[PDB]
RNA sequence: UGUAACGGGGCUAAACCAUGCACCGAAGCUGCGGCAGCGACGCUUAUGCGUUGUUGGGUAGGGGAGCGUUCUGUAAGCCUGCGAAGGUGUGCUGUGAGGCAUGCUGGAGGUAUCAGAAGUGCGAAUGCUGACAUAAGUAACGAUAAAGCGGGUGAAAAGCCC
RNA sequence: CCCGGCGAGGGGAGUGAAAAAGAACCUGAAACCGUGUACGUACAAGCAGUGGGAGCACGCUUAGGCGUGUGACUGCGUACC
């Protein structure tokens, strides 16, 4: 705290309470007693625990029928109108779309829709596999996920 | 299985002591430290 | 005025008090 | 995060200050005095739930002793008569009869005297 | 006419058509109880005193309602010893209504 | 020479019980100008007991 | 028909004014004006000028006869206290309070 | 139900005349304080005056046992610093004899406003006569 | 300092001794109802369900289980100008921390559940800051060089001007 | 427009969704100070309450009597840290 390290009054003689610093955390415009620092909240997860979790929730999405597998999922031109038409034809609104390739027209056509997210098979995460209502996997993306996860 | 259906295992998370928040908490005014020692002092204690 | 209050506190204690007023050493 | 605690401390003080209605002075206005007074009132209430049962028994007994001496027998002879006559009427009811139905109290006295003779 | 009977560990002077708050019974809210162990029946200088209870006497009552009493606050406080407790309590009861005193 | 407990507002009101003002009972009326004045005082216009004792 | 007049921020203490205001509570206004006329306090000047304003407001804005009017409510509230520093001996300072008031006169026929 | 309480409006009180000739002081006084309190009535209530008006006469002919006629001492204090005073029984009988009965009963009565109200019903007279014939008092032997 | 060495009144028993029967008398014991803990036992556990005993004063202190607050996700969801938060009442409810509903004010935000993180709960620290009391309408109004009157101005003159 | 000192301040009128949004201006808690109503209080002694409890006033109501406010008297009772 910006201040001076001078006693605001002497120790005794006056009728007031003892005080040593105006920066005291009991004063107005004093310091914080346990003032915070920038800290890293990242936790370690073991690798086998991460894969155990993914194998658990992918098994659960199967048991809950929240997993849809298709051979191919492409949009011709990078248009969100085409993607929304295709998902309406699939009867899908809140969906994660995993593709074993890098499809740029699909990324661009899915960038404006907040109900829809498009990932690579490498870039899958458990919280997104849960936060989305349906998950559409290309069969190639299945082959890559099964290979990564043994 | 959603983010509002998860719950951890039993006995995994224990609450943790919070000293100096009332009589009912048990850890009252002194907070497990007794009265008027060196050990009750802030930073007090003897070395190894 | 708490600035004229600054005067108040800053120096109605810096007046310093005179002292005890009974010549008594309880000795 | 900085939890600001004005709402909680206000409602916590008003729960006490509502309990302190009727009290004199700062006991109904000031939390420091009122809380100190509400606790004592809970202490007295705990105590006087026990003392109620003493004080009414004392009242009942004094009324039975009066009505029995009106019929010419003491309390200690009258309870002993009703024990020896096996009459298990408690002395709330005996004080009630001693007030409202003096004939039945007289009949109880004559039953107790016959139990003593 | 009145009568005296035991219920709930305590006794009740009661005439007909009265509503009496008793200690909690295991009886439904419309059924009929019968207190056979009656202690005293007075019928206007026609008393009879139960030596251990009146033999032929019975009190026929109808269960009106169950319920819980008023909340009471239990406060324990040991001064200057850093101790207090709080405890509320509501006591179950059962209001009955006397259908009739069968002498 | 100073108190040890704060005196209540009840004692404050009881001390102020005698600090009430007494209203003037009745104003005398001049017989000539018919205006009101204090008994035994001159009027605002300068009359007293009828006569004009001072011009203004 | 009630008619209100207020002198807010009256430079005087409420305790000093309530002595005067208690004289004319419930009185007819001709009697209250004579009492305040022959009361020697400064608060009588204040509360008389307020009663005169309430009368004229009741007559102008509400169509009321002056002879039937009557002081039904009168009360003095505490105003803002301007605060000054008065120096004392040995360098000690005292903050004096310079009290104000809110005079309110309600007049009506009832 | 609730336990009956007497009410000061519906309560009835009676009048009794006691002759205090030859009777023992304290054994008289405890029966007087019993009947001023109302502990002879089934409608006794601690906070209610249910007792009876009592006229005590021939108060100067009350008797005490032992040497208490010359040895019982009635102390009091005037408030002033030397103001301890002292009177014996036979001095109080010659000087003001009603006080003896009044003091004994006041000591056997409760302390408080109600006990003082109970004492207001005690009406002692040194002689054998009273002006309270209008209240049709009954006799009582204690 | 005042009886002042029965608690007092008062007592010649209303004192003492002996014997006896009564009764009063505690939060003790019993009765009725309710809660919870630990053990048995049986079930067939939803791993708790009957019965059963027994336990339940408690500082330092150890252990166990919870309430509420702010923030993040759930939540581009839900509630909300047909009135949010907040403020003030009332009623109900839970063993408690607390909770719910609603009247008035207010006039735009709030947030279930399940998890997560804490600047997470104040009556005291001759605690810090602000506001308001108290004494109290009291003391005082600063050299004991001194004022009085007329007229004027003015809403108003002991204090201004002549 | 009016009272007022060609004042302060206020009552109206008017604006505005709203002026108990009027510049001492969002919401406006508490302490503190008041006005009004009900009850109690001037023979009465103490942590100011609690248990009982009369009466009075006020609401509901099938009068059933419950509530609510006050609280004469009375048993017990010497704040917190
Ligand atoms: Mg230095
Ligand atoms: Mg600053
Ligand atoms: Mg700071
Ligand atoms: Mg790694
Ligand atoms: Mg310490
Ligand atoms: Mg030590
Ligand atoms: Mg130690
Ligand atoms: Mg240190
Ligand atoms: Mg915040
Ligand atoms: Mg209040
Ligand atoms: Mg002190
Ligand atoms: Mg005065
Ligand atoms: Mg100087
Ligand atoms: Mg006593
Ligand atoms: Mg002496
Ligand atoms: Mg013996
Ligand atoms: Mg017994
Ligand atoms: Mg008992
Ligand atoms: Mg027990
Ligand atoms: Mg049991
Ligand atoms: Mg125990
Ligand atoms: Mg325990
Ligand atoms: Mg402990
Ligand atoms: Mg509303
Ligand atoms: Mg918020
Ligand atoms: Mg709210
Ligand atoms: Mg609201
Ligand atoms: Mg949120
Ligand atoms: Mg903190
Ligand atoms: Mg605080
Ligand atoms: Mg503390
Ligand atoms: Mg402090
Ligand atoms: Mg003052
Ligand atoms: Mg003084
Ligand atoms: Mg003086
Ligand atoms: Mg002076
Ligand atoms: Mg001067
Ligand atoms: Mg002049
Ligand atoms: Mg001068
Ligand atoms: Mg103006
Ligand atoms: Mg302001
Ligand atoms: Mg706004
Ligand atoms: Mg505002
Ligand atoms: Mg307020
Ligand atoms: Mg009176
Ligand atoms: Mg009186
Ligand atoms: Mg006193
Ligand atoms: Mg009660």
mmCIF file of N, CA, C and O in Angstrom, chain F residues 28-53:
data_model
loop_
_atom_site.group_PDB
_atom_site.id
_atom_site.type_symbol
_atom_site.label_atom_id
_atom_site.label_comp_id
_atom_site.label_asym_id
_atom_site.label_seq_id
_atom_site.Cartn_x
_atom_site.Cartn_y
_atom_site.Cartn_z
ATOM 1 N N UNK F 28 -55.651 42.241 26.874
ATOM 2 C CA UNK F 28 -56.555 43.336 27.117
ATOM 3 C C UNK F 28 -56.842 44.087 25.833
ATOM 4 O O UNK F 28 -56.068 44.049 24.880
ATOM 5 N N UNK F 29 -58.012 44.708 25.787
ATOM 6 C CA UNK F 29 -58.491 45.423 24.616
ATOM 7 C C UNK F 29 -58.665 46.892 24.939
ATOM 8 O O UNK F 29 -59.326 47.242 25.919
ATOM 9 N N UNK F 30 -58.088 47.749 24.112
ATOM 10 C CA UNK F 30 -58.264 49.171 24.300
ATOM 11 C C UNK F 30 -59.713 49.535 24.070
ATOM 12 O O UNK F 30 -60.395 48.971 23.214
ATOM 13 N N UNK F 31 -60.171 50.506 24.833
ATOM 14 C CA UNK F 31 -61.558 50.916 24.807
ATOM 15 C C UNK F 31 -61.846 51.914 23.707
ATOM 16 O O UNK F 31 -63.002 52.060 23.302
ATOM 17 N N UNK F 32 -60.823 52.594 23.213
ATOM 18 C CA UNK F 32 -60.980 53.567 22.147
ATOM 19 C C UNK F 32 -60.708 52.971 20.775
ATOM 20 O O UNK F 32 -61.591 52.937 19.916
ATOM 21 N N UNK F 33 -59.496 52.488 20.559
ATOM 22 C CA UNK F 33 -59.123 51.948 19.270
ATOM 23 C C UNK F 33 -59.594 50.523 19.081
ATOM 24 O O UNK F 33 -59.597 50.024 17.952
ATOM 25 N N UNK F 34 -59.975 49.856 20.157
ATOM 26 C CA UNK F 34 -60.521 48.534 20.058
ATOM 27 C C UNK F 34 -59.511 47.472 19.733
ATOM 28 O O UNK F 34 -59.892 46.313 19.552
ATOM 29 N N UNK F 35 -58.239 47.822 19.669
ATOM 30 C CA UNK F 35 -57.212 46.854 19.360
ATOM 31 C C UNK F 35 -56.673 46.228 20.628
ATOM 32 O O UNK F 35 -56.821 46.751 21.728
ATOM 33 N N UNK F 36 -56.010 45.108 20.446
ATOM 34 C CA UNK F 36 -55.534 44.296 21.539
ATOM 35 C C UNK F 36 -54.105 44.618 21.898
ATOM 36 O O UNK F 36 -53.293 44.988 21.052
ATOM 37 N N UNK F 37 -53.819 44.497 23.182
ATOM 38 C CA UNK F 37 -52.512 44.795 23.705
ATOM 39 C C UNK F 37 -52.316 43.990 24.967
ATOM 40 O O UNK F 37 -53.226 43.314 25.460
ATOM 41 N N UNK F 38 -51.104 44.064 25.481
ATOM 42 C CA UNK F 38 -50.857 43.546 26.801
ATOM 43 C C UNK F 38 -51.491 44.440 27.832
ATOM 44 O O UNK F 38 -51.445 45.665 27.741
ATOM 45 N N UNK F 39 -52.064 43.813 28.829
ATOM 46 C CA UNK F 39 -52.578 44.552 29.952
ATOM 47 C C UNK F 39 -51.463 45.347 30.602
ATOM 48 O O UNK F 39 -50.379 44.829 30.874
ATOM 49 N N UNK F 40 -51.756 46.617 30.833
ATOM 50 C CA UNK F 40 -50.866 47.656 31.317
ATOM 51 C C UNK F 40 -49.776 48.054 30.346
ATOM 52 O O UNK F 40 -48.832 48.729 30.744
ATOM 53 N N UNK F 41 -49.875 47.699 29.078
ATOM 54 C CA UNK F 41 -48.949 48.224 28.097
ATOM 55 C C UNK F 41 -49.688 49.042 27.062
ATOM 56 O O UNK F 41 -50.889 48.887 26.851
ATOM 57 N N UNK F 42 -48.937 49.924 26.420
ATOM 58 C CA UNK F 42 -49.503 50.712 25.364
ATOM 59 C C UNK F 42 -49.698 49.859 24.131
ATOM 60 O O UNK F 42 -49.076 48.812 23.944
ATOM 61 N N UNK F 43 -50.576 50.328 23.274
ATOM 62 C CA UNK F 43 -50.845 49.642 22.041
ATOM 63 C C UNK F 43 -49.734 49.910 21.052
ATOM 64 O O UNK F 43 -48.815 50.692 21.290
ATOM 65 N N UNK F 44 -49.831 49.245 19.917
ATOM 66 C CA UNK F 44 -48.853 49.447 18.876
ATOM 67 C C UNK F 44 -49.010 50.813 18.240
ATOM 68 O O UNK F 44 -48.022 51.410 17.801
ATOM 69 N N UNK F 45 -50.238 51.314 18.163
ATOM 70 C CA UNK F 45 -50.477 52.622 17.588
ATOM 71 C C UNK F 45 -50.196 53.761 18.552
ATOM 72 O O UNK F 45 -50.117 54.911 18.114
ATOM 73 N N UNK F 46 -50.026 53.478 19.832
ATOM 74 C CA UNK F 46 -49.750 54.505 20.804
ATOM 75 C C UNK F 46 -50.903 54.926 21.668
ATOM 76 O O UNK F 46 -50.861 56.027 22.222
ATOM 77 N N UNK F 47 -51.907 54.090 21.822
ATOM 78 C CA UNK F 47 -52.992 54.337 22.744
ATOM 79 C C UNK F 47 -52.756 53.600 24.046
ATOM 80 O O UNK F 47 -52.103 52.557 24.082
ATOM 81 N N UNK F 48 -53.286 54.163 25.121
ATOM 82 C CA UNK F 48 -53.301 53.458 26.389
ATOM 83 C C UNK F 48 -54.434 54.005 27.223
ATOM 84 O O UNK F 48 -54.457 55.191 27.550
ATOM 85 N N UNK F 49 -55.360 53.127 27.560
ATOM 86 C CA UNK F 49 -56.551 53.469 28.294
ATOM 87 C C UNK F 49 -57.308 54.583 27.602
ATOM 88 O O UNK F 49 -57.759 55.551 28.212
ATOM 89 N N UNK F 50 -57.433 54.430 26.301
ATOM 90 C CA UNK F 50 -58.174 55.364 25.499
ATOM 91 C C UNK F 50 -57.356 56.428 24.828
ATOM 92 O O UNK F 50 -57.415 56.581 23.608
ATOM 93 N N UNK F 51 -56.606 57.185 25.604
ATOM 94 C CA UNK F 51 -55.963 58.346 25.036
ATOM 95 C C UNK F 51 -54.733 57.979 24.233
ATOM 96 O O UNK F 51 -54.070 56.971 24.476
ATOM 97 N N UNK F 52 -54.438 58.837 23.272
ATOM 98 C CA UNK F 52 -53.283 58.724 22.405
ATOM 99 C C UNK F 52 -52.095 59.305 23.144
ATOM 100 O O UNK F 52 -51.897 60.518 23.153
ATOM 101 N N UNK F 53 -51.283 58.456 23.763
ATOM 102 C CA UNK F 53 -50.269 59.005 24.641
ATOM 103 C C UNK F 53 -49.045 59.450 23.884
ATOM 104 O O UNK F 53 -48.244 60.227 24.413
#
